[PDB]
Write a protein that binds this ligand. Sequence first.
Ligand code: ZN
Length: 237
Amino acid sequence: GPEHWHKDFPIAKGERQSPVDIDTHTAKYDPSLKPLSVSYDQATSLRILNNGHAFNVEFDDSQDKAVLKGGPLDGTYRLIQFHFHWGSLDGQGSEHTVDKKKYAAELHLVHWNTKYGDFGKAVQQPDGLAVLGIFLKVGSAKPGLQKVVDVLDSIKTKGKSADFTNFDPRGLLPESLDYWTYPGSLTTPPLLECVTWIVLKEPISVSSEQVLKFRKMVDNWRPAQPLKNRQIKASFK
Ligand SMILES: [Zn+2]
């Protein structure tokens, strides 16, 4: 596991690895950051599948039917999938941290830069993927989330999948798209340094009834990585 990733994947000791802690004092507000555009009105989900590390909802990236522009990014990024990381106890579970503070879970909406013509060729570049990072606090319910948790048992174990259509990812957004952003990597192997992270300040809510159905596979995240030379910029003053 994570301590012995550097064996098979030596990018793991790299100068741009993710996730990172976000000490808010140093995270200086950049006003050249345009604001965050999200066109998901024609997002076409295909499958939900437990891959024996987490569960991924797959999307149709055949054309610009669900795209991410603005923020720090040059061009159009296509939604390809989203998946979660989550813990055992609930004061642990998120990949990223804020002043060392940790959420129950983190939701990662993954997009790839159409400059490069598919995910395969995108993952090979520094500006290849843009990953939209959203925290989960446990609290008020999430109707957006409810359509997911429902079907979690028709994929109990590693390898099982399902049809999963007309899922609307905009149900997973918070009311504030204020964000920190830094250059980083996949949090899981192959840990490729091909990612412009977009971590949102505002978490969403999920009910206790929702986090328990997500286990009935725990602590499936990765420790804070060294920030090295990198600046974290912030969209909010
Ligand atoms: Zn992830």
